[PDB]
């Protein structure tokens, strides 16, 4: 009885992006221990890569209270687990989470192109809001991170970006 | 010479909205002090309704300053008097508002996709910015005191969700 | 059970004497929103006349939990449109709302010969107590302004006394 | 040589009053104190009434210090003791001192009456000052306790209403 | 254009009222440098003198603020010299002050029933609010302190009442 | 590789609207300085102009921040000299500043319909978020102005307006 | 009737560093936001450079103040493009900032030397004042970065430098 303008194709949407912000909040997590291991023992980068996983996991949470206050219904899936068990050198950790992170704004374009169809102007909006220029943002952040990650090289460098940037 | 891009039909529509705004103030009032008579006591809810009828009231001068700035023309009507002389229950007032609040929405989304097919970006945005995901929120917030209201049930119930959950 | 002293005819008068009220309360926010035109651009009476808007409110208000605390029934009407859609300059402006306070101030004599004509020693003076002399202050303010407004002029002083007097 | 427009039977009135007043601060203590009684044991209500019989005590010590204003000699009565040893339920109580509230503002309009009748105007001001707006309160309060007295209903709801709402 | 339900004839007696305020004030002042005399040289009633006139003063402000209020105007007289040039023991300049607030008493309590019969509402509450519980406050605190100088009689205690009573 | 649903015609558009942002801010650091000319000397405009050049210069900026977040390339043209040397009046330069900001104004609503058209969802709530509402603020700013700047005429009015409202 | 002293010569030549000051300030500019570009990604040196960038537009603003002072006229020109739409590596920019300045350098002593053939005392030691020291150890900064920017070499060298030392 308050659902009003929420077309239900819109509604299953926003349950594919729920169970897709869990699934990049769990491989951030895989991530941030992975370079908690002794055999990588970088530790900013596992800081930085754990507090990645909690904002993923603040993603489901708004798409979650999103889909109650527009009288949708919540369903959760199974959240897969990581396609890697490690996750290389730092910087091919930084570039699995770019291409992670382009995948979830694509999806979230498809929401927003889908919510348009059906007139959901208010859906629109939200969405705009709370993730685009953020995915955005986030994308840029980790376009410089893999560009000065290159710069600095192996070894002494990877070690030093990871402490005074990274965390 | 400040009109740019504001269509005549958008005009006329941010008027129609400025009444609606100001009937769903006024019906407000009227709860508002019907909690306050001595045969319903409810200071709660008149506490409550107070202000939203203040909101109310702030909205339609929003749009007014809106009219303004983008060199329309205010035009006003009679504010109706409200459907109802008293309004029943604590949980019957709330249902009211839900209704009204659904109605001001759907003139919301009108007035929304009317810009749009004018194409009018800025009147979008402020519509959105402003109210929409207002509308959105107040809308969950009514149909959660609903819920609860049936949940407390009659008699002490209804004066604990009036004293300890509105104002 | 709470009622005492207090005639049906007077019940009826706070009853109108409310909607006038809330018709200055509306007369009034008119003259603050036409102030805000960009082909009038005064910042000041709108400032002022949107204050003045939320006083009469506020005098509405008073009324309506006077009728409550007497045991009586509030019944609200229409609020009535203004008689104007513009206000013309500052000096006409405000001499409107000199006006409209005599119209007021009367009916509230009216209203007061009333309650003392069934008896009503405590209308009588709630009456006077919040109502009788705040008229005759603000009348005499109005004059004030009306005078001041005719020795500054038009053009420039109407500006300066805008600014520096209004808000 | 202090005495002025000061009739001989407004005097007696005002002795009568004090006697009136005194009547009411003798029941509302015999009120507070059967609420402290373990058969009751309602805390809230036995602050509640406390109160108002020092209140009414308050009232008593005012028209005394306006008969040695005017000019007048306070002619002290015994003071009756209340109409019931015990009082029944809390709503049965407030239903009791709504009518004792009831039966003071008769006879604080009829002193008015008097006064005015003799021309007194300085009396009818000074009674309209510090009795009948406050005994319209009063009156308007206990109604408002006797609605939700009925309303969170006998048991659980006279303990919530004791403890929450009075004292 | 400010005037309203305003009384020639009242006009005419807050005119006389203002030229007896002010005459109060100037046989206050008198009072007062009498007593900074040396064979008189009380300078508690020195003090307490010229404070009754600056607050007799103040009351012709007041009364003249009241003119302009009401759409009056301001016509001035003459203040004639006050009845004695010195004013023998303290306790007899007291009981000239009691027979002179008596006197203004009578003219406010005159001008009251005027306004009255002219059904001036407001100017009825006015002289309430503003003069009359003054007055009877005044020839109570005067009344005492006759009864008090008489107690302490002739001499020494004439000296004590000054020092530790007035000022 | 972070390029996302950045369009090629709006990464140029991106471009012109930074020459486009540079012009204004180069348009208004002219008017600031012929107002600090001896001939003109109007401190207070001085100081406005002095300050929208400086926010058309950041408005430059957050659009070649844009395109570096979206992965685009930003490439400069000449900054246009402005279209005057001097400006005549203050009422003229405001006026040229009205045309500057609403022909700022329709390129970047023909940005956004362009973003529009190739579904960058994105880019259009970031010139929602950034301009279109500030450039509507600064339109109405600027025809108030104006239409004061009329009132209050030639000679001190001028004087006038530019030291109390304009810097 | 305020110029005094001041060549026909000077006063173009001021003009001139003029468009120098505000070319410079472009150019910066565009080597500020290269350096924010995701390819680069050197956030140390963005800082750097948009600091520059504004400084350089004050010296142009001090001009412009000094040819009002003076009772010159400003005469404004097109801003050129810079010279590069992308600048290398960083010490490839610090290196093409050195030659901009000490092109600034020659073009400041040169309009030095033009005023003090012209005899302008005021002029020569103005400039002195503003801007030759400042030039000199704005060449001695750039020189030093340079070396350093040798020393810590491209790659690891260069992200430190970056961010350690620039910004």
Redesign the interface.
């Known amino acids: 009885?308050?659902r009003?303008?929420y077309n239900e194709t819109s509604e299953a949407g926003v349950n594919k992006q729920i169970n897709l912000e869990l699934y990049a909040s769990y491989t951030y997590l895989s991530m941030a221990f992975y370079f908690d291991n002794t055999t990588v023992a970088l530790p900013g980068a596992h800081k930085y890569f754990k507090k990645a996983s909690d904002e993923e996991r603040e993603h489901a949470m708004l798409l979650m209270k999103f889909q109650?206050?527009?009288?949708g219904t919540i369903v959760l899936q199974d959240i897969k687990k990581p396609e890697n068990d490690s996750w290389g050198s730092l910087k091919d950790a930084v570039q699995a989470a770019?291409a992670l992170e382009?995948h979830v704004?694509?999806s979230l374009?498809d929401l927003?192109?889908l919510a348009d169809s059906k007139?959901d102007?208010?859906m629109?909006?939200?969405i705009?809001?709370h993730f685009?220029?953020e995915?955005?943002?986030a994308?840029?952040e980790?376009?410089?991170?893999?560009?000065?990650l290159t710069?600095?090289?192996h070894g002494?460098?990877e070690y030093?970006?990871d402490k005074?940037?990274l965390g």
């Open positions: 009885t308050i009003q303008n109650n206050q527009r009288g770019l382009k704004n694509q374009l927003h192109k007139g102007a208010q629109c909006d939200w705009e809001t685009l220029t995915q955005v943002e994308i840029k980790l376009g410089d991170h893999i560009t000065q710069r600095v090289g002494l460098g030093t970006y005074e940037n």
